[PDB]
Amino acid sequence: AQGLYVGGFVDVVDQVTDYLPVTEPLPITIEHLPETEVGWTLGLFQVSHGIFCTGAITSPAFLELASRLADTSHVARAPVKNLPKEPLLEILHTWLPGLSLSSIHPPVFQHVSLCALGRRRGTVAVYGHDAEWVVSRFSSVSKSERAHILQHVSSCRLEDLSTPNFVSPLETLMAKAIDAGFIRDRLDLLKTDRGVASILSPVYLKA
Amino acid sequence: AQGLYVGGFVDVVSEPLPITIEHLPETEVGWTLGLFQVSHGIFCTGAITSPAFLELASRLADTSHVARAPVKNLPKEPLLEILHTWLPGLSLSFQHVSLCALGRRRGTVAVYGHDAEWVVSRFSSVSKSERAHILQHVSSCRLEDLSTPNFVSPLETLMAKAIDAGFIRDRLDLLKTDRGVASILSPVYLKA
Ligand SMILES: [K+]
């Protein structure tokens, strides 16, 4: 429970099913905003149900931020359900539950973004300290597919990843957070996404 | 179009108090200019004067979707619009009055504006006589002379609240009904 991992689909089934996989670390950002790098992807793969992504959140500045947020957030006092209390993971599921891959349409992909809500359905993320647990949450990802994905995750020492560029003004992130509460049916959409992604309970998802 | 006024019910039946954010400490953004007993409830009027808070709200409006949203019926007012997206509700603690993501009681939706008369006129549940009393009281207060609001809370604390607001169940629906309960007349910058 030292490292922070994230995983989920960036797309659930022109097309990018030909520039995959991307095993090289891509930056993980927030709401496609510049200077919001929080970590790196540990692999983008094509699988039966879509393009699955895995990554690690390493940005110390961001982890500090996320940590301060969880301290005052309602998630800090929220009653335990099925899992032990993990403010960090829970605040992430309240704040940035979605995933979005950025690409040009026709260095083919620039980054993966954590966001308030994915534009594509079933693009809900799963945050965790255990990569295997994280990937196993997706019942739509076969055993062989998972084993493969994890092989890539473990083959990389997070300790060798460069420091993410996270300096963006906090106001900019706050504005996105404010705008999110007004995204219509966000909570409903978020609930559907969970199903579309075939995520298994228990998870720290907040909807 | 300089000063910032806020108006709305803190309770719908049918000495200046500080105006804060989500009942948090050190989030005074201004002062209540009066709490009035009107037919439909307790109507509140206040002036948003905190320079720090106004700069922040202004900074937020600049990068918010509100600064890019197409004109509807009214002219663009990023500051007013971000306040209606961020803190559209009111809640009376009398200790203080807080601007919230959603009011504790129904019908407590706020109306932000630069014109106090326009603000109060949005509430058709407030009679003409009541409005005249409220406005006479309002304009009898020179704003450039109220004590500076203590706005020093870490930005983190406010952001946590904004993130939580996003997960308040039925928030946008309750805000819509709150508007009906308060009998607010269009056009207004409310976002629900
Ligand atoms: K491989």
UniProtKB/Swiss-Prot annotation, chain B:
- Tell me the part of the parent protein that is shown: 2 to 230 of 534
What taxonomic ancestry is recorded?
Viruses, Duplodnaviria, Heunggongvirae, Peploviricota, Herviviricetes
What the protein does comes down to: Protease that plays an essential role in virion assembly within the nucleus. Catalyzes the cleavage of the assembly protein after formation of the spherical procapsid. By that cleavage, the capsid matures and gains its icosahedral shape. The cleavage sites seem to include -Ala-Ser-, -Ala-Ala-, as well as Ala-Thr bonds. Assemblin and cleavages products are evicted from the capsid before or during DNA packaging.
Question: Its catalytic activity?
Answer: Cleaves -Ala-|-Ser- and -Ala-|-Ala- bonds in the scaffold protein
Q: Provide the active-site residues from the annotation.
A: H23 (charge relay system), S91 (charge relay system), H96 (charge relay system)
Annotated compartments: Host nucleus
- Subunit structure of this chain's protein: Exists in a monomer-dimer equilibrium with the dimer being the active species.
Query: What is this protein's name?
Result: Assemblin
